[PDB]
Amino acid sequence: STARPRIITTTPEQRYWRQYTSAQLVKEHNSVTHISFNPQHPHDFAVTSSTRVQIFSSRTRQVIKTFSRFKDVVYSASFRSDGKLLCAGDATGLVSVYDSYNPRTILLSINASTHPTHVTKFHTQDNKILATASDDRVTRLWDISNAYEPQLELTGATDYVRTLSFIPAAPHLVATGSYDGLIRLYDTRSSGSTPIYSLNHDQPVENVIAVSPTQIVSCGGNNFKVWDLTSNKKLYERGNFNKAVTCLDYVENFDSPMQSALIASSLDGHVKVFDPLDNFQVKFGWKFSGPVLSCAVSPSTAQGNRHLVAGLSSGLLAIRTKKKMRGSEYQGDQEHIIHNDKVRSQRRMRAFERNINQFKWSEALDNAFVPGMAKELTLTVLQELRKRGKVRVALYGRDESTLEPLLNWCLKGIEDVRSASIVADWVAVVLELYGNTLESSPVLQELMIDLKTKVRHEIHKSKEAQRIEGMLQLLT
Amino acid sequence: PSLSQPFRLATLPKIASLSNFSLQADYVQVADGTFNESTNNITLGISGSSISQYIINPTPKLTFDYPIPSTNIITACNAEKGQANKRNVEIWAFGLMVNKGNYTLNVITKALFLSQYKIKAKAKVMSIKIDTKNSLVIAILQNGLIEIFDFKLTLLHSFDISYDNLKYAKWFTENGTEYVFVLCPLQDDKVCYKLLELTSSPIKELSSTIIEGFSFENSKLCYQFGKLYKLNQGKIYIYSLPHCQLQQVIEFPMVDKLSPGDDLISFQPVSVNRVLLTVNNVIYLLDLLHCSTLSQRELTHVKTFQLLKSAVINSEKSHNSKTIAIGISTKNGPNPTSSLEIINIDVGTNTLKDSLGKSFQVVILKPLFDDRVKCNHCNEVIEKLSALQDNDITSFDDIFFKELKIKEEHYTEKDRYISDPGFLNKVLDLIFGKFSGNDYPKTLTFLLTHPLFPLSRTRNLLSLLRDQPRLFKQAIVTCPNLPLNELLEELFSIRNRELLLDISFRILQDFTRDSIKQEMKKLSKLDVQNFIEFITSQSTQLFQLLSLVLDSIGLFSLEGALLENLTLYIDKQVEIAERNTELWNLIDTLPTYTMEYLDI
Amino acid sequence: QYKLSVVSGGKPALNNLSSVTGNKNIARLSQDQRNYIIPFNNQIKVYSVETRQCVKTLKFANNSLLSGIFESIVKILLGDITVAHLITVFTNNGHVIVLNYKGKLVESPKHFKISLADEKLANVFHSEGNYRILTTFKNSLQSYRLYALTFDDAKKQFEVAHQAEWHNVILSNISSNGKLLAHMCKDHKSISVVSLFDDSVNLSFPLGSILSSQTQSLSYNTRYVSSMAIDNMGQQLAVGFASGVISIVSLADLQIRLLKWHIDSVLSLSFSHDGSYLLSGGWEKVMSLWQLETNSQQFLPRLNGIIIDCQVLGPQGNYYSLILQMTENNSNSDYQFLLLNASDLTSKLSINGPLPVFNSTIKHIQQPISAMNTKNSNSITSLNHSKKKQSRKLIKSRRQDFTTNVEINPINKNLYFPHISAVQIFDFYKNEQVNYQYLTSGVNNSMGKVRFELNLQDPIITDLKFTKDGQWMITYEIEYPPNDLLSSKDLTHILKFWTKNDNETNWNLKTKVINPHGISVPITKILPSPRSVNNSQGCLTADNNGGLKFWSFDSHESNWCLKKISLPNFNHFSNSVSLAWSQDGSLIFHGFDDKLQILDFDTFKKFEVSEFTLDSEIQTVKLINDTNLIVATRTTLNAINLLRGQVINSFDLYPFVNGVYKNGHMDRLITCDERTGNIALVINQQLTDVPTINYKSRIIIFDSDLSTKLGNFTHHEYISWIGWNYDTDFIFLDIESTLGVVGTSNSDIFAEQLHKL
Amino acid sequence: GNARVTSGDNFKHVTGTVTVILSQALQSNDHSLLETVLNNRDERVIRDTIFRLKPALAVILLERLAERIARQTHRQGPLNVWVKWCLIIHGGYLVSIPNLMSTLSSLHSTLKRRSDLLPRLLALDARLDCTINKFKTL
RNA sequence: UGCGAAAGCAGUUGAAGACAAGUCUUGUCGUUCGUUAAAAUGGCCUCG
C-alpha cells in the first residue's frame, strides 16, 4: 500500500528583495542628505538632516542618539572603520568628530576652511587620517593627532568637490569627483596636490564609490559608469535612470542568492539594484513619493534583520527591513540500537481535497465556488473532477438555487484564457442536463443571456487576436 | 577547406646543384623554430647561396642574410629566439659539408653578430635542435652520434645510438618533455626505430624496435602528432609511436596511375589527420581519418611544385583553421626558373562535414537470406527498347510492361525490383528520343509515378507535359522533386481552375512557407496581380497560398484600388466561414387544476 | 563468434484455469516459514522472507530433465512424497519431480509419472500421508474426476484409484485445510460441497435458493457468481457476485447473510483458519478484512493492482498472500505476488517479472471479468466473443507488431520499461525489479477505478530516453481527455526532463514543457545528443510535420531551454520519421516521409546531395560508423556511404515486413553497436497445412556496410525488442518476458557431533 | 516539486496625448507611470500617442504590453488596441529590425493563446445559441 | 473493423441451439457456427 498522492495545485534574486516587506516612513525637519551605517554590531545607521545627525537602532528602528550641536546644516555622518567615532561636516566649514553614542564630548574639532565642507570621510585602511572636501575645491587629508595643519592638501578641481572615495586594498590611492565632470585619482604616497590622471564623466559627478579593488563606479548626470583602474576606461555604463542619479551603495558577500548588490539612487523617486556579476544589469527597484537623495543598505555582517534605507528631499526617511517524566529528552545516545518508526502527519488538507479523497463529487464542486476562494485553486478542483471523469456526476442533484454559483464563476472565468476551455466543458454539460429546468426558471435564463453576450465578446477578442497575429507575420 | 593561390617569396639562384629539380627540395632547409602557426618569419637555408630570413606579412621581404660559399650544401638548419647570458637574442645553427672531406657545425648569435663559432663535425649533420632555456644546441650526425653543445660549440655530451647511416630524425614535444625518434636503414629492407628522451646522461633511450618491409629509396616520410606517415607506391602507411606500429594503410588511386620516374611527389602534414600531397603541378589537401580529398588545386603556370614545410595546426586545441605552407615551384619554358612560394591553406574544422561526398576511392536487391511461414536484366531491356523503330508506342509499352511483369500503369509496391535508377534514366532518354510531339507511351505515366524518378530530368518536365493535360495533371500529383521555381511559374500562368488547385496543393505539401516566400518575390507584379484578380472572380490551401503571396508582395507594392476589392471579397468569405462553422457545431450537437376528457 | 543465451527470467507462473477460483496461487511457504518458493514460467525461485532476497534459483535450462519436461507446474508439495529441503513438483500432464532447494541441484531427480487417460492434472492436496488428485476431462464446460494417489515402494510407481466425478463444473474452490471441495455445476446452477478424504461432508443445493428474489428480478450481473470460498469447518460458504455483493451461507440450514461494500465484481474471497474473518478483494485495489462477529471491516487500500486471489498463510495467520493484476496494461496480464505481514500489513515480499507493454494483445490473454465491458475489462457476455475475436485477429489479420519500447541506462545498465503512466526499473543481472515510479499525473494510485471510471485512460509514456552521460532522463507523454465532453478530442503532449544522482534511486522532475511543438502536434521522435555537443546535455525532438527542435541544458538558467528550432510547416503528415546524429555532432540526418535531409547543426538548416529520395517511407535511419549510414524503408534496407554518396548494399525486406509493423517500430527492432556491427531481427509466423499462433524469430548480425553476415541465429519465439547494451553484447526481449543476450581424529568427530547437537 | 512549467512557444532562448509620460515611463521602467498612461480607453488618444512616439521606443512598448497582457489576460482586449496601432504606424520601422521573434516572442506567444480559444468558443456559442432560441420562442 | 495524421477516408453486424416470462408472442445466454469487424443504499485503513 502506498500513501495517497496529494492534489497538485519572478526570479530568486527578486524574491529575496521582495522580502523587505515592512515599510516604515519617518519625517525629518529638512532634506536628508547623507545616510551611513555603522560597520560594527548593532550596525546602527546615522542620517544627516537639517542641523542634526540622528542614529537609529537597527532592531528598534528608532532614534537612539541625536547630535544637535551643529548650528548650521550638517553634511556627513560617516563612521570610522571600527565604529567608535563619527565625523560630520558643516556649512560653516567646521568638521567635528564625536564619539559614537556619546554626543556630549567632542574628541576633535577642525576648521577645514571658511567654505562649506560637504564630505568628511574616514580613511578605511588607516584610522588616524580623516578626509575632508570643501567648496574651497581642495580635499584636505587631516590626521586626528595633527589638528592644526592637514597632512596633505589635494587640489586641481575647478569646481565643487562633493565626492570622495578610498579604493580598497590601495591605501595610497584617493578618488575625488568634482562638478567639472572629472574624476581625479591621487597618490598620497607621493607629494600629491596633482592628480595621477583624470577620468571624464561629462556630467557633474554627485557620488563616487569603489565597488572593488580595481573597479570604481561613479554616478553622475543621468547614468552611472563603472571604470577599471588597470585599463583606465569605462567598462560598462547604464542609463536606465530618468533624473540625475545622486547616491550609490555597494554590499558584498551577504546571504542572498545574489553575491553582490549595487544600490543606486535616481532623483526621480527610483532606487534600483544592479548585479555586478551580470554586467551591472537591473534586477530590482523601489519607488518613493519624491526624489531620492541618499540610499544605504545594512553591511554584509549585519547579524540581524537587514535594512534598506532611502533618503528623500522632502525629509522623508523610508526604511524597508528583511527580518531574520524526567527521561523524555534522552534520545538514546548510550544505547546499542536506535529504532525510529514514527511518521510525520501529512500537511493539512483543504475542504475540497478532503471531499475528493472521500469521493464527494457534488460537495467538492460546492467548495470550488465559496466566498474568498482563490481563482487558481478553484480551477484545480474543476480540473480534478474532469480528470476523475466526474463532471455530469457532480451536476445531477442540482437546481437553479445551487446552479447559480457555478454559472456566476463561469461568467467571469470565460474571460480568462486559462479557464476558458474548462468553462466551455462545464457549461456545455449543464445545458445538456438542465435544458428543461431552464425553461421553467426565469433566473437561469438571464444567467445564460449575459453568458451568451460575454462568450460573444470573447469570440471578437479571439478573432481580433488572429488579425494582429496575421499582421505580425507580415512584418517578419 | 580550400587552397589559396601561391604567392612568391623569393627566386632561387641559378646554381648547378639546384638545377636538378628532382633533388631541389633536399638542398633547401626550413628552420623548424621560426616556421609555425603564429610566427611571421621564415628562416630558410639555400645550399650554396646563403641562409636567409624573410617576413611573410604584410609583404614578403628579406630581413637578414648570411652568405655561404657556393661549394657548400646545407644539411641541417634551425633558428630560435631566446634569452642568453640577459639579452634577447636569436641563435642560428647550421651545418655545412664540403666535398665530403670535412663537416662544419656553425652557431651564430644575433642581438634582437654577437658571436660566431665553428667546429669540425665528425659526420654529416641531419637534424639540429636549439634549446634556448638551457642554452644548448643538439646535433644528430649520420654516424649515429648525438652531440650536445653549448652556444660556444663546446661539446658537453655525446650519445651513440650504435647504428650508422641515419636517414630520418624528427623532434617533438609531449607534455613538456622533448623527444626525438630516428630511423636507420638495415639490409633486407629492415630498419631500427629508436625513441630517445631528452632530460649522468641527458639522453635516455625509451624504445628500440626493428621494422620489416620498410623501404627508403622510393618512400616519402613525415611525422605528426605521434603518427609517422609513409607514402610509397600510392599507399600511405601510418605508424604509431612510441613503438612505431603500423596502424593503417590508405590506398590513394590517383597516384597509382603515375609512371615511375617522371612524376615529382612531395608529402607534408598540415593538421590532425590532414596532410598536403602534390603531384607535379597539382596540390591536394587530404583527410586521412575519413580518407577524403578536402581540396584540390592545379597550378597551370608551373611545371612542378615541391612542398618544403608547412605550419601544422593542432586543430583539437586551436580555433584557427588557416595555416601556410612553403614550397618550390618550377616554371615552364626552355629556361626553367625556380621560385620559393607560400600557399595559404584552410584546413577546416576536422569534422565529417568537410569530407562528405569527397571520397578518393571509386546495385541489385539481394535476398535477405540464402535459404511453412506466413507470406506478407536491365541491360537486356534497354537493348530491346532501343532497337525499335521511332514512334512505336505499342511495342515500347508492350516490351516494358511484359518484360518487367508490371501490371499497372502506375508504380506500385510490387515494382521494387525495377527501382534500379540506372535503368530508369536510360528509359527516359529512350522515351524522349523515341517519341516527340503529341504522343508519348504509357511507360512515361508509370515512370512519373515512380518515387525514384531521376532528379536530372525533373527540370522542364512541366513544359514537356504542357501539351497533354492528363500527363501534366499526373506530374503535379505524383512526380517527385519537381522544382518549385517552375511550379510557381505555371501556377500564375495557367488559367485552368483544376490545375491551379492541384498545383497549390503540391507546392505547399513539398515546400516550406519560408522557401516558397522567397521565390514569390521574384515573380512579376502583373502576374501576381492577375492571380489576385483570379481569386476575387481545399480552397484554404489556395487562400493560404494567397496569404503567402501578400506577404511576398510586401506593404509597399500593393495598390489601394485592388486592395479594396480583395478587402470586400474576403469579408464575404469570413462571413460565410463563420456561418458554416455555426452549422457544423449544430450537427455535432404540476397545475393545481386541469380539465381533461376521459376515454370510455 | 556470437552466441545467444537466455539470461533474465519471465512472468510468475499461475494456475491459469478458468474454473478454479481462490486456488490460483501455486507459490508455497516452507514448513519452517523461512523462505517462499515461487514457480516462474522458466524457473523456480526461492526467496528468503527474512532478508527479502532470492537465495536460490532452479533454472529449467540447466537441468536436462527439466529442459526436456518444461507444460506448467500445477502444484508444489513440501518434502518428498516417496520418502529436509525437498519439494515435489506436479505438472499438468503428470510428471512428478522431486527437486531440492538450499543446496546444489542434482542432475538426476527422482522423476516419476502418474498414468492418466486423456486427463489433465488440475490440483493435488494432502492432509496426513493421504493424497488425492483432481483431473480435468472433456457444452464448453470441463468435467472433473477425483482420484486417490499412492506410491507403492515395491513397484516404485504412482497408482491412481478413482473416487468421484462431477460434470459441467463452472467454478470450484478448496478450503484452506485442503479437505473440502466446493463447486458449482449446471445440473440454473447448483452448488455442492464434498469432503475429500472422508464422507463426512456431502451436500448439494440449487443456487436459486441462495439467490435473493430481488436478485432474480434484477440483471444477470446480480445472479453471476465470480468468487467462492469454503470454510475449513464446512459450516460457512461465501459467494461473490459480479454486482459486488458477498453472501455468506450457513450450510446447516441455508441461511443467508449479505455483506455489501464492493461496487464492482468481487474477484477473490478467502476465509480465515478459524473462520472469523473473510478477506475480500476486487477491482478497487483495496483488500478488505471483514470481521464477521461484528460485521466490521479493515482496509488495505492503494495496492499495485486489482486483487485476483487472497489467502491467509500460517498456523496463526502470520501472512497474507495476494495476487495482483495491474490491469492498466491491456497488452499482457501482469501478475505480481505480494506477501504481507498480518501484524502491520507491510509488504514482507513482493515478486514480479519485467513488465513490458506490447503494442497489441499477445497469445490468449483475456481481460478480467467486470460488471461492465470496458477497455480494461470484459463483461460476463463479452468474454466468449472477445476470445473468439482475439483468436480470429491473431489468425486472419496481417498487422502483428507486438513490439515494445525498452531503454538501457548507460551508467547502471538497468533496464527501463515504460509501463503505462509509470516506469519499471528492472535489474536483469539480478533478475529483480529495482523500482516502480509514476512519471505522469492522472488517477494512478489515488483510487481504484470501478465501472465507468474504468473507461478512463491515464497518460501514456510514449517515449523514454537517456542522455549519453546518463544523468538526465527525457520522457514524452500523451494525456487523453475524458469522453463525453467538448474537449474530448484534444490530446495533450508533454515533455519532461528528470535528473537523478547515482546514489539515489528516484528520478526528480526538473522541467516540464506542456504542448511542445505546438498544440495537438505529436513528438514522433526523440534523439539525445552526442557527447561532443553540450557534453550530452541536449536532445532533438521531431514531429510528423517535419519540425525539429533542439533543447539544451543551460547552467545559468539551470534548466533545459529550446536552444534551436526549424519549423517547416509542411502541409502533409507522416508518422515515419527517423533521426541520426554524427558522432562529431556537425551533421544531423532527418528522414521525413520518403525523403532524407542532411542538416548542418550549426545553422540548423539544410546543408549546402543532402536530399535523398527513397522507395518508401524511412522507418529507421542509423549510422553504424561515421562513414556508413544504414536506412531502412518499408521495402528494403540500404547501406549508403556518406563519403561517396552511393549505396553499397541493398537487402529486400518486403517478403518478411510488408504490413506487419506500424511505422516507427523497425527502429526498435533494428539495433546498432558503435564498434562492431548492427543487428536485424525478423519474425515469421509458423503454419502447417492457415497461420498459427506460434512465431519464430531470427537474428542477423551485420558488419558495417552489410557486406557480410557475422552470425545468423534463430529464437523459437517472437522477439518484441532488441537493443545494444553499452558493452559488446545485445539484449533482446521476447514476449514471454524473457531477456536473452546475443554476444561474443577424535577432535573431528567431536566437532561434527557438537555441530549436530 | 519545484520544477518550473513552460510551453513550446517560449522563443526566449532561441491635445490630450500622453506621449511624454509614456516615453519617460518606458525609458525609466516606471510601472506606476506606465499604468496611468495605459488606463485611457479613448481610441483617439491611443493612435495619437503612438503617432508621435519615437520609433526606437515603439519596440520596447510592444514588449511591455506583451508582459502586461500575459500576467492579466482580462486586459487582452484594451491593450490589443495599443499593439494594433504600434504595428500600423511603426510598421516601416519594425521591418528594418535584425530580429523580431526573439524580441517579440512574448507578444507572438500571447497572441497564439487567444486564437486557440476561437474554435472552442464558437462550439460553446452554437450550443448556447441553440438553447437560447429554444425557450425564447417558447 | 482496415488504412491514415491528430483530420478523416472506406466498411460491418448475420444463422442457429437451449432455457425464463407472458399466452401463440417476447427476452436471456458460465452455448455453438460464420464476418477484417447502468442501477442488490453498494467509495479507498491505523500510525496523535
Residue of D28, D100, D129 with shortest CB distance to A476: D100
Which residues lie across from C463 on neighbouring strands?
Answer: C476
Residue-by-residue DSSP string for A44-106: -EEEEETTEEEEE-TTT-SEEEEE---SS-B---PBPTTSSEEEEEBTTSEEEEEETTEEEEE
Q: Which residues contact C91 (CB under 8 A, 6 or more apart)?
A: C69, C70, C71, C72, C73, C74, C97, C121
Residue of B nearest to D124 (CA): B585
- Residue B395: which H helix or E strand, with range? helix B393-404
Amino acid letter, residue A291: P
Strand E contact nucleotides, protein CB < 7 Å: 1-7, 19, 28-32, 34-45, 47-48
Distance from CA of D123 to the nearest CA of B (A): 6
Supply the DSSP string of B1-12, one letter for each residue: -EEPPPEEEEEP
By the 10 Å C-beta count (0-12 exposed, 13-18 middle, 19+ buried), A62 is classed as: exposed
Q: Does residue C388 approach strand E to less than 7 Å at its CB?
A: yes
Measuring CA to CA, how many Å separate A9 from each of A353, A404, C690?
10, 25, 56
Distance in angstroms, CA of C386 to C1' of E27? 23
- Longest CA–CA span in chain D (Å) reads 61
Chain B residues in contact with A470 by the CB 8 A cut-off are 547
- Compute CA distances C500 → A5, B86, B111, C322, C411, whole Å: 21, 59, 63, 33, 11
Count of other CB atoms within 10 angstroms of residue C528: 18
Q: Which of residues 292-351 of C touch strand E (CB under 7 A)?
A: 298-302, 345
Nearest residue for E7, CA–C1': C573
CA distance B177 to B200: 18
How is the beta sheet containing C255-260 ordered, strand by strand? C225-230, C236-241, C245-250, C255-260
Helices (H), B537-559: 539-557
Pairwise CB contact (< 8 Å): D122 & B589: no
Residue C267, judged by CB atoms within 10 A of its CB (0-12, 13-18, 19+), counts as buried
Residue C440's Cβ-side half-sphere holds a number of Cα atoms within 13 Å equal to 29
First-last CA distance in chain C:
54
3-state helix, strand, coil in chain B (%, to 5): 30, 35, 35
User: Could you tell me the distance in Å between the CA of residue D75 and the C1' of nucleotide E7?
Assistant: 34
Among candidate residues C415, C245, C442, the one with its CA nearest the CA of residue C328 = C442
Q: Are A396 and A433 in contact (CB under 8 A)?
A: yes
Name the nearest CA neighbour of B165 among B182, B188, B150, B152.
B182
The residue behind cell 493612435 is D47
Q: How many CA atoms lie within 13 A of B34 on its CB side?
A: 25
**Residue C414: DSSP 8-state:** -
The Å distance, CA of C213 to C1' of E24, is 29
C1' of E33 to CA of C325 (Å)? 33
CB C733 within 8 A of CB C404: yes
How far apart, in whole angstroms, are the C-alpha atoms of residue A471 and residue D85?
Answer: 11
Q: A276: distance to nearest CA of chain C, Å?
A: 15
**Any A CB within 8 A of B547 CB:** yes
B-C contacts at Cβ under 8 angstroms: 124
Report the length, in residues, of chain A: 476
Q: How far is CA A231 from CA A186, A209, A216, A279, D49, in A?
A: 16, 18, 12, 17, 45
Q: What is the DSSP string of D66-85?
A: HHHHHH-GGGHHHHHHHHHH
Secondary structure, 3-state, B147-191: EEEECCCCEEEEEECCCCCCCEEEEEEECCEEEEEEEEECCCCEE
Euclidean distance between CA atoms D79 and B248, whole angstroms: 70
C1' nearest to CA of C285: which nucleotide? E44
Which of A289, A321, A246 minimizes the C-alpha distance to A61?
Answer: A321
Chain A residue nearest residue B554, CA to CA:
A474
Grid cell listed for C28: 508455497
Residue of C nearest to B292 (CA): C643
All residues at 6 or more sequence positions from C104 whose CB lies less than 8 Å from its CB, including other chains: none
| B contact test, residue of D120, D122, D132 with most B CBs within 10 A | D122
Interface list for chain C against chain A, based on CB atoms closer than 8 Å: 300-303, 345, 441-447, 452-453, 455-456, 482, 484-487
Which residues are CB-contacts of B377 (< 8 A; sequence separation ≥ 6)? Answer: none
Q: CA-CA-CA-CA torsion for C615, C617, C620, C625, nearest 10 degrees? A: 40
Question: Which residues of B fall below an 8 Å CB-CB distance to C?
Answer: 290-292, 349, 351-353, 355-359, 361, 363-369, 372-376, 413, 416, 419, 451-452, 455, 480-481, 505, 508-510, 512-515, 541
SS3 sequence of B295-350: EEEECCCCCEEEEEEECCECCCCCCCCEEEEEEEEECCCCCCCEEEEEEEEECCCC
Question: For strand E, is any atom closer than 7 Å to the CB of C389?
Answer: yes
Nearest CB to D3: which of C510, C557, C564?
C510
Under DSSP, the state recorded for B272 is T
How far apart CA B164 and CA B157 sit, in angstroms, is 18
CB A290 within 8 A of CB A265: no
Would you state the cell numbers that stand for residue D29, as one nine-digit string?
A: 521602467
CA-CA distance, A241 to A268, in Å (whole number)? 8
Q: Indicate the SS3 state at residue C450.
A: coil
B162: closest CA among B178, B180, B182? B182
**What's the grid cell of residue A136?**
574651497
Residues of D in contact with B588 (CB under 8 A): 123
Q: Which residues contact A328 (CB under 8 A, 6 or more apart)?
A: none
- C15: CB partners within 8 A, 6+ apart: C23, C24, C25, C26, C74, C123
The H or E element that residue B429 is part of is helix B421-434
Residue C460: CB less than 7 A from any atom in strand E = no
Quote the cell numbers at residue C248: 455468506
Neighbours of A402 (CB within 10 A): 14
Exposure pattern of C719-731 as b/e (b: 16+ CB <10 Å)? bbbbbbbeeebbb
DSSP label at C627?
S
Q: Are C682 and C626 in contact (CB under 8 A)?
A: no
Cβ A380 vs Cβ A421: under 8 Å? no
DSSP state of B252: -
Residue with cell 491491456: C330
C448: which DSSP letter? -
Among all residues of chain A, which has the CA nearest to that of B548?
Answer: A474
In units of Å, what resolution does this entry have? 2.7
d(CA C59, CA C73): 14
Cβ distance of B375 and C636 shorter than 8 Å: no
CA distance A322 to A301: 14
Q: Are the C-beta atoms of residues B251 and B268 closer than 8 Å to each other?
A: no
The single-letter DSSP state of residue C536 is G
CA-CA distances (angstroms) from residue C647 to B115, B253, B420, B535, C706? 67, 20, 11, 47, 11
- Which residues, 6+ apart, have CB-to-CB distance to C274 below 8 Å? none
Q: How far off is chain C from D104, nearest CA to CA, in Å?
A: 16
CA count, 13 A, side-chain hemisphere, B522: 9
Cell 502536434 found at: C521
Contacts of D27 in chain A (CB under 8 A): 240, 242
Is B239 in contact with B231 (CB distance < 8 Å)?
no
**Min CA distance, A235 vs chain B (Å)?**
27
- CA separation (Å) from A190 to A151, A187, A194, B342? 12, 6, 10, 56
Q: How large is the angle between the packed helices D19-28 and D55-71, nearest 10 degrees?
A: 70
C-alpha cell of A190?
Answer: 607621493
* CB-CB under 8 Å, D91 with B588: no
Using an 8 Å CB-CB cutoff, list chain C residues near A414: none
Helix (H) or strand (E) holding C245: strand C245-250
Choose the mutation target among C511, C562, C565 for the interface with D, i.e. most D CBs under 10 Å: C562
Rounded Cα–Cα distance for residues C501 and C435 (Å): 15
Place of cell 446552479: A403
Q: By C-alpha distance, which of D42, D52, D58, D124 is closest to D92?
A: D58
Angle at C501 between CA C498 and CA C504, to 5 degrees: 105
Phi, psi of B535 (to 5 degrees): -70, -45
Q: CB pairs under 8 A, 24+ apart, for C468-472?
A: C468/C410, C468/C528, C468/C529, C468/C530, C468/C531, C468/C536, C469/C410, C469/C531, C469/C535, C469/C536, C469/C537, C470/C409, C470/C410, C470/C411, C470/C412, C471/C411, C471/C499, C471/C500, C472/C497, C472/C498, C472/C499, C472/C537, C472/C553
The three-point CA angle A371-A376-A380 to 5° equals 100
DSSP one-letter code for A346:
P
Residues in chain D: 138
| CB contact at 8 A, A72 and A51 | yes
H or E segment to which residue C350 belongs: strand C346-351
CA distances (Å), origin B324, targets A101, B224, C645, D65: 76, 16, 31, 55
Query: CA-CA distance, A382 to A395, in Å (whole number)?
Result: 12
Closest among C103, C116, C191, C170 to C146, alpha carbons compared:
C116
Could you check: is the Cβ of residue C239 within 7 Å of any atom of nucleic acid strand E?
A: no
Chain D residues with CB under 8 Å of A464 CB are 77, 80
Query: In Å, how far are A2, A344, B454, C208, C438 from A347, measured between CA atoms?
Result: 16, 9, 69, 52, 21
Q: Are A223 and A241 in contact (CB under 8 A)?
A: yes
B110 Cα distance to chain centroid: 43
Instruction: Provide DSSP, chain D.
Output: --PEEEETT-TT------HHHHHHHHHHT-HHHHHHHHT---HHHHHHHHHHS-HHHHHHHHHHHHHHHHH-GGGHHHHHHHHHHHHHHTHHHHHS-S-STTTSHHHHHHHHHHHHHHHHHHHHHHHHHHHHHHHHH-
Residue type, A32: V
Instruction: Establish if D55 touches chain A: CB-CB under 8 angstroms.
Output: no
CA C641 to chain centre: 42
Cell numbers at C242, concatenated: 459480479
3-class SS at C666? helix
C127 Cβ contact partners less than 8 Å away, ≥ 6 residues apart: C177, C178, C179, C197
Cell 483617439, residue?
Answer: D44
Give the number of other CB atoms < 10 A from CB of residue C103.
Answer: 9
Residue C415 exposed, middle or buried by CB count within 10 Å (0-12, 13-18, 19+): buried
Q: Which single residue has its CA nearest the C1' atom of nucleotide E32?
A: C139
DSSP A133-153: EETTS-EEEEESS--SS-SEE
Per CB distance under 8 Å, which residues of A are interface residues toward D? 240-242, 268, 270, 282, 285, 287, 415-418, 420-421, 423-424, 427-428, 431, 435, 438-439, 445, 448-449, 451-452, 455-456, 458-459, 461-466, 468-469, 471-472, 475-476
Label each residue of A348-372 as H, E or C. Answer: CCCHHHHHHHCCCHHHHHHHHCCCC
Give CB contacts under 8 A, 24+ apart, made by A130-134.
A130/A87, A130/A95, A130/A97, A131/A164, A131/A166, A131/A174, A132/A89, A132/A95, A133/A161, A133/A162, A133/A163, A133/A164, A133/A176, A134/A89, A134/A93, A134/A161
Q: For the purposes of burial, counting CB atoms within 10 Å of the CB of C747, is it exposed (0-12), middle (13-18) or buried (19 or more)? A: exposed
Three cell numbers written together for B182 = 630516428
For residue A400, the SS3 value is helix
Q: In Å, how far from its chain's centre is CA B141?
A: 40
Distance C136 CA to E44 C1' (A): 39
Between the CA of residue B416 and those of B363, C636, C638, what are the distances in Å?
13, 9, 13
Can you give the C-alpha Rg of chain D in angstroms? 19
What is the residue whose three cell numbers read 461484528?
Answer: C294
Q: 3-class DSSP state for residue B484?
A: helix
Contact between A131 and A139 under an 8 Å Cβ cutoff? The reply is: yes
Which residue of B551, B574, B581 to mutate against A (max A Cβ within 10 Å)? B551
3-state SS record for A301-320: CCCCCEEEEEEECCCCEEEE
Q: For helices B378-386 and B421-434, give the axis angle rounded to 10 degrees.
A: 0
